Every structure is written in structure tokens, then in C-alpha cells.
Amino acid sequence: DRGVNTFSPEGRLFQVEYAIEGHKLGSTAIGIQTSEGVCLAVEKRITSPLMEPSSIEKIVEIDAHIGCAMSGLIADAKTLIDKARVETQNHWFTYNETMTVESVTQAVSNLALQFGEEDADPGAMSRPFGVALLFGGVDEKGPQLFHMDPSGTFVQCDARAIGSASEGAQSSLQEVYHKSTTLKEAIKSSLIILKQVMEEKLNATNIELATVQPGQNFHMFTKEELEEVIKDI
Amino acid sequence: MAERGYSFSLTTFSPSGKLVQIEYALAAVAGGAPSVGIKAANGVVLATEKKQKSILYDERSVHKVEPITKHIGLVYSGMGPDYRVLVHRARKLAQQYYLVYQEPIPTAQLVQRVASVMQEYTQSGGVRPFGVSLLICGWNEGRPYLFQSDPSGAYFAWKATAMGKNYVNGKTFLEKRYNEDLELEDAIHTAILTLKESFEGQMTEDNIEVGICNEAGFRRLTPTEVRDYLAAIA
Amino acid sequence: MSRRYDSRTTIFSPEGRLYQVEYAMEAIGHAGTCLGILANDGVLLAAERRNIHKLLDEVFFSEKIYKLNEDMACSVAGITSDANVLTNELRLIAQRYLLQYQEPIPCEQLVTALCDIKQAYTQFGGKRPFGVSLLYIGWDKHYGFQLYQSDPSGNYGGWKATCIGNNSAAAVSMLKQDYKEGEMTLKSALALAVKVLNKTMDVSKLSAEKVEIATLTRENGKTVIRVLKQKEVEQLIKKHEEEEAKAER
Amino acid sequence: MEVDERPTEQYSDIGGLDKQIQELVEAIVLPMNHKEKFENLGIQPPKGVLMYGPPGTGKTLLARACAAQTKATFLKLAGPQLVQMFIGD
Amino acid sequence: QSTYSRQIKQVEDDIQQLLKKINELTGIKESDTGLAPPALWDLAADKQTLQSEQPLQVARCTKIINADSEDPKYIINVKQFAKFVVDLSDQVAPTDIEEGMRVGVDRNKYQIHIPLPPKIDPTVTMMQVEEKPDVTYSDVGGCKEQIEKLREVVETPLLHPERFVNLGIEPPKGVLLFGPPGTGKTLCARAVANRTDACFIPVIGSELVQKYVGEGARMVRELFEMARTKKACLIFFDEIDAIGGARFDDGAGGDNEVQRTMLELINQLDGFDPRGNIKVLMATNRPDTLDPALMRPGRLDRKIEFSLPDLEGRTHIFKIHARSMSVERDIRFELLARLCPNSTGAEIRSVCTEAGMFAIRARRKIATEKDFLEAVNKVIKSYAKFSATPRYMTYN
Amino acid sequence: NQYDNDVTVWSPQGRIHQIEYAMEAVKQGSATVGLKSKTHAVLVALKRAQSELAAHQKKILHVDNHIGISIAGLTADARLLCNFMRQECLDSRFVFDRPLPVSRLVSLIGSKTQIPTQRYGRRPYGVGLLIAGYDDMGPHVFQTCPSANYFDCRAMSIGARSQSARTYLERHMSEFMQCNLDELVKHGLRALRETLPAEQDLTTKNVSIGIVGKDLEFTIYDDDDVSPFLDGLEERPQ
Amino acid sequence: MSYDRAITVFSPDGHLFQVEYAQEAVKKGSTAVGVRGRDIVVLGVEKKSVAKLQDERTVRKICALDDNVCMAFAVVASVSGLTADARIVINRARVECQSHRLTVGDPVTVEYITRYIASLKQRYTQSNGRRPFGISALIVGFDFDGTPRLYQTDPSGTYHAWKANAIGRGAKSVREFLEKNYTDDAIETDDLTIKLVIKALLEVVQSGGKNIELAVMRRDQPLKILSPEEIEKYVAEIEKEKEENE
């Protein structure tokens, strides 16, 4: 086909630069790291009032103590989560300790660029991934939020938002949040940017929030407990 | 280390009951060497153009008339390398039959199995099917038989057919002409006359090569003998 | 290069479907026709050989209809070349299932399994899908007498009278018109089979050399698959003369 | 195309690549005036010089500059100009 | 309505036929167009008929050749396309007859009666330059940094070359404009042209490439020369992916056409004489999709950045677009700006306008806050989606 | 175009265009300085972050407690080579039990990164590694490219306008072997600023430090554990 | 999985050419609506194309992936018939379903199938010879909790829980026609769900209940595919009803 080895004279891939535009049409995800937990926010994308928030999630379990909220292209997120889930469970038998939020993000980051037009294998691709994932979980070093992106780089962040506008959703988050603060203020800060960047506005079946504290397991929130977080936008 | 290159289909269906690239292969056998085959009904005789038109030919075993086994012989028209593999494969197939049955491979069967590789090479990318067509003889069922296997992999059943230069014209002349109930000696005489009609230029005995299949078994006629037949008839 | 061509074999086209799959159907149109008809106590296959030539020796008396098993039969509609490979795969599948099953191979079961291979190539492997639609006739206990039709597209169909190969639209209607659901018995059906072949050919005049007729009739304790000799078909060619009158009347 | 000098853009606009400057001044300017010497030695005066390299090196820079300074009879021809929309005119 | 439409159809047909006769017949009815003030002019007009200097034939001076033997020789091309050599004007200056200058020459004697205003030597170059409007900064969104560089590079050296001497460089021969489309680059470009008092000549790359290549070559050279006559000018080459596209020539494609036109432009950039204080401005998607061969970086100078509005960046454009417009609102400029995703400036500008069209729908005549809210939701979806080719397989 | 994306079209110099692009990829990536002594090896790398409410990504990666690597370029391409370097070093340690020389390890990496340059339709990687190691001979800083070509240097700097950093390094080349662990870092800091504009010097949170030896085990200093190694720098030597 | 070109190359649109082309390939497997009841979760398909010389089994868009999970397919388009390309997604889906029964022997979950399918499509992208997919499935089945499930998946790789969803001939359009028809009564009453499926199919197809074949699946009993003849009886009443909601 038309070049999939394509470098610019600056020295980056055109194809990677193309990958971001896909994320922008997709879903919106907020991850905030708190001292007192990690809270994860994600767009459910309502479009009927018949879609049940308790039965279906897009906050999903990597481990029983670790969560990941997805953004951008949905199909692409699933492939990264299934390899990451096994790596995590295999880690638990062997070490007998929960996997660092950083440890899982590094593994997925390998997949992002390895593409080429021909000589492709499962470890390689025909075009780079356009999803950014927010892996949030509590480990022995404390609550951490690590951020993985389409360029296949891992960075520690105490607040990252990626969605309809990646940089836009992160600039709203830069104004509100402060580094060290209470759980309710972090949960409030995640919802608040979310409705403004989106076309869609804040409801209790519009978005999905689940919170991981340290000393707790991953809990996906009940119908009532999802509605409690809505009162403070 | 590793090779790729060409692995997508190279062959596209044409509405004619055949693909484009195989149709072109059949022209290749036409520009191939003249080979004639007539079933005499008491053996089959097959005759082929010995030459590759350098006219230095010194054959003692390097023939294009080859015994595969006890009662199967092959003469071809078209490509040399493509043919050598079919001969090597044929012995392995004949023997494959010889192990199970304790008789070698009937004409029909040998054709089914050779035909499957020739098609294989079509559908697959990075390969091309043979440029060879076979005149296959055999004695099975208590009757001599002669089959034509084309470079496509299709088979056409023939009691007499001609290949090489003017093959098309060759088939119509045989379809009308073909004979049966022929003595062994006569079998050679008819076969040489048909070869005269396909093949141009000089014939002596280092220009044409003849092999016969009968009850005793397939063998390949000595250059002295061919000459005596050639002279005899008008 | 290889990166500057198109053939859209594994790649989907603007159509939403591959070129290679659609083209295979065109090749099938101008190649000899195969039909299978249902009778009350058997099933039969009748086919037009790919040989339009005036002289055949009959080295292989299966040049269209090959009997795979003692429980099954097939026809070829398309190119004889892709058939050769397929014929060899069929002698193994048909007998393997039977070793295990000890019951005459179900007509449906066979086709779906085969159709899976036809589709496998077009989707992956970078090979084109076989240029041959195979018409399977068989009998199993839990559907009864059957005819199933195979495509290069991986489409299967449960039929009682169908025809594939050349001028198929005409042919299926012509089999429906003469032969309704469950109407016609095995002998009278063999006649009907030749009558449609005479009309529909790539090149006219129906002869013993151009046709091969196969019967599945259940004999005393065994289901017997025979390909009829030229001699028997000839008695049906006169029967086919009688049949033309009979359809009309 | 008719003679009238084209300006100097000077050779003291490019420093370095000295060796290359010497080759251009010898090649182009000398056989033009000094044809007698090219004949004396025994050679024909060139049928031209091709200046090639990567863009921006000063391939054109030296030729135009040197030619004015020396005083020469300068024809201004441009390759794309010569091609026209009428066929083989 | 089938029976009702026939009645109406016949009645018009008859009335329409009758009209043809009336119109033709009436005419202007043997009147004179000139009226009363031209009567005195008729008498003049007759004197002129007798005279040999009238009528003049327009021509153009092609070339200056001296082998003088009367008064200076010039070869002109007559518009019957016979070349004739004429001589210095009967009383007018030799400094008015120049190469590429128009001249009026007698029809009966062929000598220069009077020279005329210059240029008519190309047919095509005259066609390629089009009308010029002015739009001002008010109308073009943003006071951003991206906006600021366009002015500094274009306005300052041409307006005052003094500043550019002080620094110790020449005013740019070349200038590069880059940034993806749908940002108001052309709009900004119009806006600096008025301030600078530097004439902008718009040019289209699509006219330059043509079936047979060579027309575009002569056109480009002639175009530089015209601009060179103008003092402190800009030749703005808009929408070019001919003089703007990839460097490559297939050698049986339309790519041949591109390569001749580019190649002359390189010759022009350096010049037959240099181009201090003359700017050519070129618009490309980004400088990496522009030639490394046509880009010979010293001459081109500064590359002026324009980039796709940011979320903050679009908050800024939207206040300008809104303020310029007459609108009655309750909701604020920032909210709606964050509401939009990162896409283009163009969707966000259309919101301001679409709210006015919803007002007519709503049965108001000016916008309101609810019209505004409605406009973001429809606009983001509409323009972005339902576009673009669904393939990027098997291209060069 | 498409003759520059082919890994089977070459220049008349005999250079494949795809290898040429692949070297530049390093150069757009952030500057890293790697130095050696005769007791230690120091990796100083320049960081980046997405936001002010974030900590910077370690560009120093942990392999073993005797060998350590620092990346400049694409992280995802980096991670495949990283999975390869960890696999070989650990192998060496189980089977041979020698605290692997740098010099053997880089040559094998050179083989792998060369494979896509020969493959049709596959792009070369475009990340630069300065691999710091300590074996029983002493420390070595080897630099491996996106091509096979690998360097044994006393000090090297790769990235933007990296030639300028080498000049500082060459003036203090001898000194490096005498100096201490603490100083080797400070001389690294002073090289790293030469690459960047003279309008800017380093700060505490854009410096990552990776220290290597077997007189010490491997350490990564992040954004605030950087400070003790950082003190002692000169603002833009020209 | 062997080719010599990439299967797709990326665009700055952020669409995959092959997944969108696949969506049309799955509307070849015609229109399918499924509604979730209290105890019977029902899906029905468009066209059986009856000529009484055929079998009804062979054209089915209803495929049994297990004996307690079943699905009907489509997505968007209007393009020509062909069961076959869709049938291929079923053949992968049926292994996927069956491997889970080996792992968890209770009636296998809908969620598992949908998730595996989204990831399965991305994976095919990566291999140069493998043809991607992009389909929607109406997954019907039961959990080990005995509660009804109707799930649906999309070419965008995303699966959602629903009380009624329809796919085919404009996915959003058949779905919206059901949104009107839905009331709170509908889902608990067993009788009411069946009528919803038949009104949606009756729109795009002429003379249904010969081109409407639907299956009910139950908490305790496996897949039952109803005869067409008993479905026609419903179609006649229900078509009276369909005009009323409009």
C-alpha cells in the first residue's frame, strides 16, 4: 500500500501523528491520583434510557485492586487490557504482591509503535494504536495513576485527562485540581471538566465513577452510590 | 534468513471457464515441441520431437520419452524443468500405488494427483503453474489408454491428440483420422506419419524420438528402428 | 514492487466485499452445468463434462461426477483444475466421518465443513477462493434424501432441485417447473435430468460422451452409488426425448 | 539571451570550498577569452561544465559572481523558459 | 393537481406567444443613442476620417534593437501578428517606449503616435491575477502569537526597510506562510495588506499547471517582472499544491506540469538581479511537504507559524467573531469554546453565525442564548463528519 | 514519496533513505550525556512532562543492578529493545555468572536493529541508547544507534546539536577517570546544557540521574531525589 | 495469514477503511431485532426467501453459538444478500462461546462474547493477511443468576446492556422505531416482547411470518426455533398494531 514506514524529515512517524485524531472522536476519560485513593471517571455514552449502568461498565478490572478507564477508539482498548490482565494475575501468584501502576503501563506501551507495512506479526502492527489508557490502582507504594498514551509512552501524573480534546480536558484539570487533597474534592474535580469538554452534560447514567482507596479492593459503585457522587459536580 | 515477495493472488477469473494466466500457459505448450499420441488399441504409442532445434542431438538416455514404470511412459510438450519434476513426482506416485496395490498407478489416477499440484501453483501467490502438458499412456483394465493433462490442470480425454506447433489444427486432424485395431509395427508407422504432419523440417532419427507401450511393457525404441518406420510410409 | 498493486483478495473493496469472490461466479457461468434432483427413494446427479470435444476415450469416467464414498456423490461446476484438488480432499473427509459415524454421511454436515475451507482462503492466506461450486448429493436418516449446493463464497444451501454451472437461473426454474416438492420418482427423475442438460450447455448437442449420470438409490441394506456407463445413459437420452412431451402435456 | 552582463553576487559570500572555486574560474572564464591557450596546449575549449551538488552550496553563486567581475559576454537562458505550450516550437 | 396544471399551462403559452411579436416590433424605433451633446463631436469626427494618424492600432514593443539610421528602431508585434519595425515617437519621449511597454502606432503609417500605459505582452498572466478586497483584524479571529508573527515578518520590512538595515539583513526576498487550513490565513493576509500599504496580488496554483507545459513557465516569469515594477509588493500564491506539493516527477503524469512551473520559480527567487524588499508569500500545509529544492532556506527567510486553534486558543477567536456580530446573549464565550472539541476554528466561528439563523427559525430577528446552545451541538457533528475519502491504501 | 518509503531503494552513495530518517529521530529526541570513570558510570538525561500536575517520566530505565540504560527517542520502540537487553543480560548472569561487559552486549543489539533496515516494508527503530555498564575491567559507556554502528567512548553526548557537548567533554576527558561519582554527574550537567539554547539552563525537575557501578547498586534519581547530585554546575560554558 | 501489502493504512480521519467496509459486509446478513423480556429473550431475522424447494435452516441469520447463547446479526447498509461473510464471524464466535463452556459450565455470559469479538477485530488489523471484521451482534443469553440478558456489540468495538435493540437497514433508525414502541409494561409481559420484534422486521420486509422466523430462549430450556407457521398468526394481528404506534 501507500507507505506505512513513513518518516518526516524532522524525525517522527506521520502515522503516529494521524493516530490522535481517532481519540478525539471517541470517549472521554479522567484519572486523578489522590493521597486517599484513585478515582476514575469515564463516559458511558447514553443514547437510550434503557442502557443499564450497573450491568455494563467501561471502568474495568485489571486486578481486584487496580482499575482502568478507557478513552478513544473502544476496540483498541480491549486488546491492551486482555494482555495486561493476564500479566497482572500471573504477577500476583509469583510475587504475592500487587502490581505497581507503573509496572502494568510499561508492558502495554511496547505495543503502540512497532508497525510496518510488511513483515507484520501479533507483536507488530499495520498501523499504530490511537488509544490512551488511564491505569489507576492502589499498590504498596501507595495510590498511583500512570498514564499511557498513543505514542506508547508511560508518565506519572497526579492528574490526567484525555478525551474529546486531550489537551483541552487536561487544561480544565490544570485550573481546578491541587496535588494533595481529599477524596471528595478529587471526585468532584474529575466530574467538572468532563461535562464542559463533551457535547453531553453530567448525569448519573451519563458517566461512570468508581473509586479505589488503598486498603480496599476495586469496587464498582452501586446505583445509589453512583447517584451520590452526582450531587457534587 | 527469510523471504517474502508476492503472496497475493496473481490469478483473476475470466468468464470462459478458465483463469487468464492459465490461458496464456496453453499458448506456451503450443510454441512447445511437437508431440503426437495415438492409441492403437493394442498398446499406446507416443512420439515426440527429439530436438530442441540446435540439430546436434546425441541421445542414449537423455530422452523426452521416459519410462516412469513398468507400463507408464510420458512424453510432453513445453517446459524442461517443469517436466523433470513431474517425472520425479510420477515415479513416487506410481510406486505409492505399487506399495498398496502391487500394481502401478492407473492413467486416471495419476492424472488426478499430478493435476492437483498444477492448480496449486495457480491459486497461490509467488508461484506460477506448469507450462507442461502430458501425453500419458498406460495399460489398465485390459485396455490401452491415453490421457491429456493440460498446463491448467484440466483434463481432456483423448484417443488421439497432438500438441506443439499447430496443436489446434492437430486435434481436428486426429479426431477425424484416429485408428484402432493396429498391429505393433503398424502402430509405429501411423504414429510417424502423424508426427510428419505436426512437426516441420527434417526427420532422421536424431530429430524424432518414439516410445511404445504394450503388453510386454513400456520401453523406448532404438534410434535405428525409428528410421525404418519413417521410410516405410507415405 | 507489490505495494502498488491491487487485486483486493484479503483486503475488502469499496463494495464491502472482495473482487476475487465475486469474479469466481463468472468463471462458473461458462463452464459445464451440474444438477441434482430429488426422488422418493433415491437422489441423482446429472452433469455436463468440461469436454466439448468430439472424441473422448473415457480414461477417467469421472470428469465431472466423482463418487467420493459409497454413501455420497459430487459434481463439479466450474474449472476442472480447482476440482482436482477438491476431489482429493473429499475422498478423505467423506470416509473419515464414516469410520467414526457408521451411518451414511449427512449431506448438510459435509458442505458446511467444506465451505469453511473455501472461505478460509479468501479471507486469509493470500490464495484465491476455488473456482468451483460442488453439488453434493447424499442421504442421512434425520433429513432424509438430500441435495446441498457449495459455493466459493462459503454459502451453502439446502435444496430439493437446483442447478449450478452454466445458465443457472433458467435451470433452477426449469427443474422447479417439471418437478415440484416430492413429485417424481427416481427413474422418471433421471430422464428430467438429461432434458435440462440438452437445453443448457456451453456448446449444443447432448451425447453420451458429453454427459455422465450418477444414481444414489438405496439397495437391499446398502446405499449404492454408481456412475452409469455410456450405454445406460444412452437409454436415458431416448427417455429424455419422451420426457420433453411429458413436461408439456 | 542577447549579451549584456548579469550582476556579481560575489564569491566572498561563500567561505571555504576553495578548491571548488578554482575549478569554476579556470573552466568557464579562461577558455572563453584565452582560446588561444587551450589550442596552444592542444585541447578543444569545453563544450561546458556541469555544477551539481545539494541545494544552497553556492553552485550558481560562484558562476554568476565570477563572470561579471572578469567582464564576459553573458547570455541569459533559462531551461523552463525554452519549453513552450506549442509542440516542438 | 394533474387536471389543474394543464389549464394554467395553456393560458401562459398563448400570452407568451403574443409577447414575441410585441417586443420585436416596438424596438427603439429609429432613435439615436447619442442625443444632443454629441452633435459638435460629429463634425470633428469627419475631420479625423480625412486624417491619416487616426485610427491608431494598438501594439506592443517586444524588443529594443539598434542599428539606428533614422531615429531609434523598435520591433513591435501587430495584432494581425505580423512583426514590423517602427521608429521613435513623432514628438513623445524615448523614455516612454520600453520593452514590454504598450504603444499606439498608426494604422496607415506604422510609426509610434503616442506610447500607451504598459503591459499587455502576456495574455495569461493578466488573467491569473484577480480582484482584491480588504478585511481588517477585527473581523479575523485572535490577537494571538500566531497572528502576531504574520505582521512582523510581512509589514515591518516592506513599510520601513530602515529597521531591517539596522539589524543588518535585507528585507526578505521570500516569506513562508504555513498552518493547516480553516484558520483564517487568507483573512489575516488581507488585513496586513491594508496596514502596510503593500499591494497584494492573489494567484491560484491550479491555473498555472495546464495540459502542455510551458505556458505556466512564461506566466511565472512575466508575473515576477510585473511585481518587480510595483514597489513594496507581495505576490501571494494561494491554494498551491503546484508550487506547493511534493518534489517528485513521475514522467508520464500531471507531475510534469508541476515541475516546470516550480523550476522557473526557483530561477525567479534568486533573480536575474536580486529581489531586496520584494516579497513572495507562499502558503503550504507545513514546510515539510514543500520542496527541499524550491526551499533554499537563506532566501525564504522566516517561516510564520499558524497552527490549529487550541481549546484556549479557540476561546480567544470566538470573542472576536461574537463581538463583531450583533448578538444578544446571556451565556459566555469561554463555556461554549470548551464545549467544542479540537478540530478546527471553523466549526466554532460557524456557531456565532448559526445562532443568528436559528433566530429566524425561532421567529425572532436577532439571536438569544438558547439559539447559541442549540448551535454548538449540531455544528460539531455536521461539518467534521460526512466528508473525507474512505481510503489511504495503494497511493503514491 | 513511495521510493523513499521503500526499504529496497537506495541513493547513489549507497545509503538507504530509511536508515537516514532513523538517525534523525534521535536528534529530535531530548539530549542525554553518558560518561565513565574507572569506578562508576553516570547517565544524565533530560526529562519532559505533560502538565504541572504531574511528575516527569524517568528516561533512565532499570535493567540490572550492575548495568543500566538511558533512552532518547521513541519510548514504544525503546521498550522492544529494552525487553531484548534485559533478556540477554539476565541470561548472562545465570549461565556465565560474569557481571556482563558492555562491549559484548551492544554488538548483539547492533544486529537486531540492523534487521528492519534489510527488510522490505519494515521501518528501522529510531531511539538512541547510552548503555552504562560495570564489569570487572571497569565501567564503559557504549552508545548504540538505530543502525549497528556502536561507539566505545569515555564520554558521549547524543541529541540536539550534540557535537558541542563533546567539546566540553574533550577538554575534561582525562579528568573523568580521576573524578568522583558526584563530580561525574556535575560534568554531565555542564555538557547537557550545550545542546539546548543558551537562553536556558537546567532545572531540578528536568534532570534525571542514573548511577551505575558494583561499588553501588543501580539508582534512579527522579525529580526531587536529583538534588544532591545536581549541586555544582556552571551556567552555559561557551 | 500471508499477504504482501498492509491490510489497512491509517488515515487522519480516525477510521478504519476495513472495519467500515466490513459493516456493509454484515448487512449482507440481513436485519435482526431482539428484545429482552422477563424470562424469554427473543430475537427475529428478516428474509427466509421461501420457494418451497429449499430448506429454511441453511439461510438462517439466527445462529446458535451454544445451547443457551444465541445471536442474530447485521449492522448498517442496504447492500445485497449473502449469509456467508457473517457466517464466518459466527464460526469464530461459536468456538469462542464453547471454549468458555469448558471454562465455566453454567450458561455462558454474553459479556464474554462481545468483549472477545471487539478485540478479535483489532487483532485481524495487525496481521497483513487477515481480513478484519466490523459487525453488530445481538447477543442473547442467560447468566448463572437466571436473569434475562440482551447485549449488543458494535463495529466501534463497544458493547452495551439494553432492554430492546435493533440492527439492520440503518442501525440507529430500527433502534429508534423500537424506542417509541417501548413502554415499561413491555419487558415484564412475555407476550409483548414478541410483538416488538415482529413490528420492526415487518417494516423492511414484505409479507413476513415467512420472512419472519424468531426464536425464543428460556432460563431453564435451550434454544427453541419456532416454526414459521405459528409466527405468521402473530404477524397478522401485530401489523394491525404496528400502524397504531405510528
Curated annotation (Swiss-Prot), chain A:
One of its GO terms (biological process) is proteasome-mediated ubiquitin-dependent protein catabolic process. SUPFAM superfamilies: N-terminal nucleophile aminohydrolases (Ntn hydrolases). The keyword rRNA processing does not apply. InterPro entries: Ntn_hydrolases_N, Proteasome_alpha, Proteasome_alpha-type, Proteasome_alpha_type_5, Proteasome_asu_N, Proteasome_sua/b. Disulfide bonds: none annotated. The modification Phosphoserine is found at S8, S48, S55. The modification Phosphothreonine is found at T47. NCBIfam families: PRK03996.1. This is Proteasome subunit alpha type-5.
Curated annotation (Swiss-Prot), chain E:
PROSITE patterns: AAA (PS00674). Its main location: cytoplasm. The modification N6-acetyllysine is found at K79, K385. One of its GO terms (cellular component) is proteasome regulatory particle, base subcomplex. GO terms for biological process: proteasome-mediated ubiquitin-dependent protein catabolic process; ubiquitin-dependent protein catabolic process. ATP binds at G179, P180, P181, G182, T183, G184, K185, T186. The keyword Transcription regulation does not apply. Keywords: Acetylation, ATP-binding, Cytoplasm, Nucleotide-binding, Phosphoprotein, Proteasome, Ubl conjugation. One of its GO terms (molecular function) is general transcription initiation factor binding. InterPro entries: 26S_Proteasome_ATPase, AAA+_ATPase, AAA_lid_3, ATPase_AAA_core, ATPase_AAA_CS, NA-bd_OB-fold, P-loop_NTPase, PRS7-like_OB. It is found in: Cytoplasm. Belongs to the AAA ATPase family. Component of the 19S proteasome regulatory particle complex. The 26S proteasome consists of a 20S core particle (CP) and two 19S regulatory subunits (RP). The regulatory particle is made of a lid composed of 9 subunits, a base containing 6 ATPases including PSMC2 and few additional components. Interacts with NDC80 and SQSTM1. Interacts with PAAF1. Interacts with TRIM5. This is 26S proteasome regulatory subunit 7. It comes from Rattus norvegicus. The gene is Psmc2.
Swiss-Prot record, chain F:
Its main location: cytoplasm. There is a cross-link at K112, K205 (Glycyl lysine isopeptide (Lys-Gly) (interchain with G-Cter in ubiquitin)). Ubiquitous. One of its GO terms (cellular component) is cytoplasm. SUPFAM superfamilies: N-terminal nucleophile aminohydrolases (Ntn hydrolases) (SSF56235). It is found in: Cytoplasm; Nucleus. Keywords: Acetylation, Cytoplasm, Glycoprotein, Immunity, Isopeptide bond, Nucleus, Phosphoprotein, Proteasome, Ubl conjugation. GO terms for biological process: immune system process; negative regulation of inflammatory response to antigenic stimulus; proteasome-mediated ubiquitin-dependent protein catabolic process. Glycans are attached at S107. The modification Phosphoserine is found at S107, S174. The keyword Transmembrane helix does not apply. One of its GO terms (molecular function) is lipopolysaccharide binding. SMART domains: Proteasome_A_N. Proteolytically cleaved from a C-terminal extension in the course of the conversion of the proteasome from its latent form into its active form. It holds the Pfam family Proteasome. The 26S proteasome consists of a 20S proteasome core and two 19S regulatory subunits. The 20S proteasome core is a barrel-shaped complex made of 28 subunits that are arranged in four stacked rings. The two outer rings are each formed by seven alpha subunits, and the two inner rings are formed by seven beta subunits. The proteolytic activity is exerted by three beta-subunits PSMB5, PSMB6 and PSMB7. Interacts with NOTCH3. Interacts with ZFAND1. Belongs to the peptidase T1A family. This is Proteasome subunit alpha type-1.
Curated annotation (Swiss-Prot), chain G:
The keyword Acetylation applies. The keyword ATP-binding does not apply. SMART domains: Proteasome_A_N. InterPro entries: Ntn_hydrolases_N, Proteasome_alpha, Proteasome_alpha-type, Proteasome_asu_N, Proteasome_sua/b. Keywords: Acetylation, Cytoplasm, Glycoprotein, Nucleus, Phosphoprotein, Proteasome. GO terms for biological process: proteasome-mediated ubiquitin-dependent protein catabolic process. GO terms for cellular component: cytoplasm; nucleus; proteasome complex; proteasome core complex; proteasome core complex, alpha-subunit complex. Glycans are attached at S136. The modification Phosphotyrosine is found at Y159. CDD domains: proteasome_alpha_type_7 (cd03755). The 26S proteasome consists of a 20S proteasome core and two 19S regulatory subunits. The 20S proteasome core is a barrel-shaped complex made of 28 subunits that are arranged in four stacked rings. The two outer rings are each formed by seven alpha subunits, and the two inner rings are formed by seven beta subunits. The proteolytic activity is exerted by three beta-subunits PSMB5, PSMB6 and PSMB7. PSMA7 interacts directly with the PSMG1-PSMG2 heterodimer which promotes 20S proteasome assembly. Interacts with HIF1A. Interacts with RAB7A. Interacts with PRKN. Interacts with ABL1 and ABL2. Belongs to the peptidase T1A family. This is Proteasome subunit alpha type-7. It comes from Rattus norvegicus (Rat). The gene is Psma7.
